[PDB]
Amino acid sequence: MENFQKVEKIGEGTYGVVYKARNKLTGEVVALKKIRLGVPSTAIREISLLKELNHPNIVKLLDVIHTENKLYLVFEFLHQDLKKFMDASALTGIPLPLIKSYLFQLLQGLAFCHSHRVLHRDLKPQNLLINTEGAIKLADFGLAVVTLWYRAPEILLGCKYYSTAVDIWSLGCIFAEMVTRRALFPGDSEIDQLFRIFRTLGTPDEVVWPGVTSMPDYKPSFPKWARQDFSKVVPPLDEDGRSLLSQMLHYDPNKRISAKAALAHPFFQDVTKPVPHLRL
Numbered sequence: 001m002e003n004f005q006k007v008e009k010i011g012e013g014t015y016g017v018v019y020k021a022r023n024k025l026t027g028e029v030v031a032l033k034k035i036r037l038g039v040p041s042t043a044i045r046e047i048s049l050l051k052e053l054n055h056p057n058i059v060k061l062l063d064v065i066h067t068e069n070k071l072y073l074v075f076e077f078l079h080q081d082l083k084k085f086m087d088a089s090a091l092t093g094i095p096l097p098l099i100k101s102y103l104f105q106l107l108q109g110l111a112f113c114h115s116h117r118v119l120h121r122d123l124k125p126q127n128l129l130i131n132t133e134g135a136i137k138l139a140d141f142g143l144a145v146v147t148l149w150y151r152a153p154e155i156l157l158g159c160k161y162y163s164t165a166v167d168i169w170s171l172g173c174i175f176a177e178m179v180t181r182r183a184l185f186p187g188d189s190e191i192d193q194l195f196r197i198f199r200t201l202g203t204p205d206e207v208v209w210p211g212v213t214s215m216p217d218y219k220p221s222f223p224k225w226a227r228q229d230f231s232k233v234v235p236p237l238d239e240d241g242r243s244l245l246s247q248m249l250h251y252d253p254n255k256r257i258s259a260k261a262a263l264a265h266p267f268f269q270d271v272t273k274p275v276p277h278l279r280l
């Protein structure tokens with residue numbers, strides 16, 4: 001790690017602390033992540049797998065530094081996250097063509113991960129990175145106050161062996177947030193998160209989600225709320241966007257649209273790649 005000059009702290013995550021840093025030998029500007037822990041052998045193999053999971057919409061893992069019984073991940077650096085961009089665009093809103101481009105690119109990144117049986121598990125605006133070229137990239141995955149706003153209901157209900165559908169749920173929540181300029185389900189506890197989902201989409205039952213009542217944390221005593229219309233949930237999003245969002249937010253993970261099928265949805269018929277106005 002003596003090969004890198006730290007410039008500034010850019011974040012703190014579940015797995016560790018991230019710095020903007022400069023390689024003293026190549027002059028390369030990178031994101032250096034110090035992993036929070038000797039390093040287990042299983043961790044080294046799983047991280048070695050991430051190195052090969054390369055795609056234009058996945059933040060590149062340049063190098064894995066396992067020296068002096070410490071672990072550092074050297075990543076590609078991007079200048080802004082979607083959280084800061086959404087905050088900067090709050091007065092006017094992100095233009096719909098740019099929302100659509102970002103959603104389309106992230107679904108391409110997800111379809112790629114998911115085809116290699118790799119789940120993100122914790123998508124959120126803070127780990128979605130953007131550049132001046134109009135690209136958006138997935139970061140902070142592959143090592144498996146905590147934000148619960150994007151957590152799929154099967155995780156909250158105690159599913160131990162959840163699927164790639166949890167990522168589709170998170171991305172649908174982020175899509176809604178880009179459109180409305182407000183978090184869709186801003187829970188501040190696991191039950192508040194669950195009940196916020198239930199108040200908008202209706203308390204799930206065996207009809208809409210077969211097997212829901214036998215889930216580890218399901219309680220028959222859950223209040224029974226009626227579902228709201230999507231026209232009320234994400235105005236002024238057009239019918240194509242609302243249709244896609246409804247499929248990304250299906251309760252049953254088996255009914256929830258896949259990343260590959262979402263890419264063929266009519267909402268992306270007129271997709272383009274606009275360039276954002278970034279203030280760096």
Ligand SMILES: CC(C)COC(=O)c1ccc2c(c1)/C(=N/Nc1ccc(S(N)(=O)=O)cc1)C(=O)N2
Nearest residue numbers: 011012013031075077078079080081084139140
């Ligand atoms: C810390 C938590 C999420 C875990 O993060 C990661 O594992 C991780 C991995 C590789 C990365 C980055 C983060 C990163 N971050 N860059 C950045 C740059 C500017 C702003 S900001 N807020 O708009 O000024 C925010 C983020 C980057 O470039 N490569």
